[PDB]
Subunit: 388 residues, 3 copies
């Protein structure tokens, strides 16, 4: 029995209210600028010669001695074109122990006609012909056909296509014809199919938090305040600010040159574990909520099924009638428009995601070719060989 004598209240049922959240999903309409060019579009060729012009007139003659030089002869544009097309470099002649008469070979304007697939010079010299000159001449050359990835910078407005050097220096790509240049021993030719930049209009998905965290294919980036940002391979400008002149957000060039340490990646790993534990806490909390709901609903049905003896059968989708032998125990006997009480929509599921990994600039095939060639020159120039 109860004591209906004495009340307490009045009471109300406390509702649960979700915590408001400012994260929304946006499709941001942008103009996307790229400078992509596919295939072997970059040719690198080097050429130099070691020259040793000596005279032996004895220790009394002031002209007794050697005049040695390492001279770079970078190929011309058309030379480099036929080198890459033939995968072959052309040099002058290999001169060894050419004395008094033939020593004039040291200054000929040799008109390069010796063809090699690859050729390293020999650092050889000798001055053992008395009262006479001696000539030694050795050539080096190399060529490679690679693919060059051109990047985008700003320097102001109007993103520009550039080539990034391993030292950090940037070189503008010519928008008229076949950017070519020369640096010491090396000559570089970049020949893309089409010139300039490409621009497309597209929507990129973002999450608005003051802060926009966006995605475009395998690119992931924080979209800035003014709706204009440049990544290495692409620039994203928000229309509505299409007709505005703005300096875009600039990527740091050093991030593409310098490698990431094992410790940095292990830190990202630890941050992922921390977020996975935080995620597991949220999931466990929702699991406990579902357990509370099933306990409440079990008691609610136990109360209502006493009045409606067909309810438990409708819940189980089998025709039956219920009869309780106890407030908790029961026995079982055998037997247009819609309204939405929930307004539940389809559940947003985080999609799969794979970030782009490209490496560092020095690891690129062209700059690796350059670095190896220079290292080979160091390796061959360690000591002088006797051309005797």
């Amino acid at each position: 029995l109860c004591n209906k004598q004495q009340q307490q209240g009045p009471f109300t049922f406390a509702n649960y209210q979700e915590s408001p959240l400012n994260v929304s999903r946006l499709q941001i309409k942008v103009t996307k600028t790229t400078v992509q060019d596919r295939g072997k579009n970059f040719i690198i060729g080097y050429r130099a010669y070691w020259r040793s012009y000596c005279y032996n007139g004895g220790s009394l003659d002031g002209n007794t001695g050697c005049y040695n030089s390492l001279n770079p002869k970078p190929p011309t544009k058309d030379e480099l074109k036929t080198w890459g097309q033939e995968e072959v470099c052309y040099t002058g002649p290999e001169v060894q122990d050419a004395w008094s008469g033939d020593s004039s070979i040291c200054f000929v304007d040799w008109k390069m006609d010796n063809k090699h697939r690859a050729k390293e010079l020999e650092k050889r010299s000798n001055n053992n012909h008395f009262a006479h000159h001696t000539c030694n001449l050795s050539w080096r050359c190399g060529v490679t056909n690679t693919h060059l990835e051109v990047r985008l910078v700003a320097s102001g407005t109007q993103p520009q296509a550039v080539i990034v050097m391993p030292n950090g220096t940037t070189r503008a790509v010519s928008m008229v014809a076949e950017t070519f240049w020369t640096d010491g021993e090396f000559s570089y030719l970049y020949s893309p199919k089409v010139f300039g930049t490409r621009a497309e209009t597209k929507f990129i998905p973002c999450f608005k938090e003051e802060k926009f965290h966006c995605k475009d294919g395998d690119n992931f980036f924080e979209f800035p305040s003014s709706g204009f940002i440049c990544l290495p391979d692409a620039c994203y400008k928000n229309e509505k600010q299409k007709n505005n002149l703005l300096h875009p957000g600039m990527w740091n060039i050093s991030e593409k040159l310098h490698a990431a340490s094992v410790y940095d990646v292990n830190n990202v790993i630890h941050s992922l574990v921390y977020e996975t534990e935080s995620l597991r806490l949220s999931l466990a909390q929702l699991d406990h909520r579902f357990s509370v709901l099933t306990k409440l609903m079990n008691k609610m049905v136990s109360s209502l099924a006493k009045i409606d003896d067909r309810l438990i059968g409708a819940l189980l989708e089998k025709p039956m009638a219920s009869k309780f032998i106890s407030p908790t125990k029961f026995m079982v006997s055998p037997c247009s428009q819609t309204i939405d009480l929930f307004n539940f929509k389809t559940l947003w599921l985080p999609q799969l995601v794979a970030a782009k990994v490209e490496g560092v600039v020095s690891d690129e095939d062209g700059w690796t070719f350059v670095a190896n060639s220079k290292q080979a020159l160091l390796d061959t120039m360690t000591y002088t060989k006797n051309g005797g």
Copy 2:
């Protein structure tokens, strides 16, 4: 009052239906091939000598001059074994300013007996003994005991154990005895406890999406179409295709040579933020659903508890009776088999995960030993010292 006069319908209750998803959890039975070998199993030894054999017969003699050479003398197999075991390299004698009679020391077949822990050569020469020969001889040597990580490639079927060079070239590991080889100055000996490959049968967990995203310890990889893939350290072959000859999926060798840039890792960071925001959206949506449910259930209990005055006490697990003073306000007075309406199972929780981070090949102890030794040779060969 209501107007029971005028109806509208008939209506129905709209149910909520979850969106179907093709992601399943699979335990995939595979044969796993490894080539693991633990401990110091790799010995690297280098040796060379600088020789300067000069003759001074005056400027008239054609034989006046120096014959200099850097000659590599890589140790033999048994030599390298006793070097690593003793942590000591053996070379010939240090010859300095040995002239006419002792200059014959420049060609002796020296029978290496000078022991060093570490030894760099000196590039010294002198030709200041008239009518006489002069000899200079300087030796270099080094040794190291390291651990070598052997990888697996395919070249077809039947994954093979190999050593990967920093330049990308691969060298097969002998499956008979103690793979040994020589390259210029250096000699390499790899001595594992057991030869060949090891194969184990195991189940790896995966998520089936056409696409399989798997995990094995700290290895994470996309399992391919034909159920055969090779990673650097292990190959995974699906039985059912155990008896089939297939080329496995091959890892790209360059991914283990070339480092990842700071920009790449920052991109993964941005992709993680994007996924965390997407995750927060899903969690907030489920939070709003729970708020809607508690509001509905509060009204449902307020309706049913009017009929069953003991229900609210059963929900609160305290004996009490209810009496409503209003459609929303009430006062309170003091007082085998089971059926599953929910069929709820235990909630799948994402487990913790830590990917393996190993670095690049050039950073390995053996190849760092090689690279430093070569750099030391460059450093010592910059100029000739006078052995006078």
Copy 3:
């Protein structure tokens, strides 16, 4: 009709119970030790000279020949201070083809007074003055002002501030005045605003799993057993073990020197996809649970609304009365304290997270300055030029 004749049971309602989880959220009170110093606090200066002192007395004289040397003259502390302050290095004189009388210039104690912004030496020599000495002298120097990041090690208890060399060697920072040192050609001066270490008391968030996975700003780390760990930039000591002497957990120095490979980062990517699929499975499972709940609640309301014809209107928050024309179809006609049945709290949401990415030691500005200077010395010392 039913057959109230024949029962079955008694039955009970099976509740759902959540799976217990040991992950908790902790605010761990720690003493945090840092050695941070902001700005250009590191000066590096190098200086050397190439000297070629030759004598030409003919092939008969034993003193005929060249005495050449590369000599390092690292600047003093005050010299390096005025170099960095002026961005200018001071050297001796450039001597070329100074013979018999002026050849005494090769040993003068030159009292460096030649100012350069940057200066590379030339490796030039000549011995073409008979019965006379010849002198050649060429200088090199450089300076840079950079920011040095000092790290923390243990060697026992009491974390210590150190500078990490690219080779892995560590050099203690003086806690008294302006740590200065000299290595060959180079001199290094590090001048921080304040000396020693800084310690702050703070709470860091963690997830307790035996295992603690913590976060501090952009630092993410596993907090160890004894509550004492040192990262590169900071050490975390748990009070309660404030008064205890413990060796802290030590970070591996090689993780900050060696870069992470593209394959390592792609593995983290694959581990993220695996966790995202696992997360999607959990979300889909909760989505199916909500679908089951709405189906149960729809039938429960259809049963109770037959008794309370105003209930459906209260659920829809519109005044109406219901009247069922079928067990599933109905028509519609127009019309203090609280109790918590749920005890639901605000949902824990995983917050955003961005790990710190700093790169490798060799990529630091100071060590890049050093590495480039040494490479320039190699480049300039490839062959001797005639000072004639």
